[PDB]
Amino acid sequence: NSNICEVCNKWGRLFCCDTCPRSFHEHCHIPSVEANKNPWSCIFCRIKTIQERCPESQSGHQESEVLMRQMLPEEQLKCEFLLLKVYCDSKSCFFASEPYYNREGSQGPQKPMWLNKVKTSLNEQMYTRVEGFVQDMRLIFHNHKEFYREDKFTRLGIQVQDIFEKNFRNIFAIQETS
Ligand SMILES: [Zn+2]
Ligand SMILES: [Zn+2]
Ligand SMILES: [Zn+2]
Numbered sequence: 001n002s003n004i005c006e007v008c009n010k011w012g013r014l015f016c017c018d019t020c021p022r023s024f025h026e027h028c029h030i031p032s033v034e035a036n037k038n039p040w041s042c043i044f045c046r047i048k049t050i051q052e053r054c055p056e057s058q059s060g061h062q063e064s065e066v067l068m069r070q071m072l073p074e075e076q077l078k079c080e081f082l083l084l085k086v087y088c089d090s091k092s093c094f095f096a097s098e099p100y101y102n103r104e105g106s107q108g109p110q111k112p113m114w115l116n117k118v119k120t121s122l123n124e125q126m127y128t129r130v131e132g133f134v135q136d137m138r139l140i141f142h143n144h145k146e147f148y149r150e151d152k153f154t155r156l157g158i159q160v161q162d163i164f165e166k167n168f169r170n171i172f173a174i175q176e177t178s
Helices: 043-053 063-068 073-087 090-096 115-123 130-148 154-171
Strands: 014-016 023-025
Touching (some): 073 130, 073 154, 090 130, 090 154, 115 130
């Protein structure tokens, strides 16, 4: 197994996947690494299993059909994996904890949002459809773009949004377009 956490790239108390060489800190893995379970399979392995069992799950989909799906166990897992993929980028640190807004010439968003809040929400089964999760995720970047205006710091939102959107298209097999 790897000797660093797959998400944050640090050593520490690591839990090792039994079906692939990845390791994780407890609360870096999403969901949090399970108390017992021998063998244990990580979220990457579980998502690979879904694909293997239903190879047609990788044919193209329309985003609008994906958003309306109910959060059954497989969609739940997919949103967990998408969320983990954003945390894997170091630039996620800017969006993880609860923000605050006090900048001359700007006003705070009406609805603040952050990754840790989406993580709690997923854990507490508060999203009934994929749409709920995806809306909160995009809301994080949108709020950032709006607040930081022409400051070059706006680019961080564009960057992490791009990671989110590429992973969304991949995980939910969105039909490729030009
Ligand atoms: Zn970690
Ligand atoms: Zn694994
Ligand atoms: Zn099938």
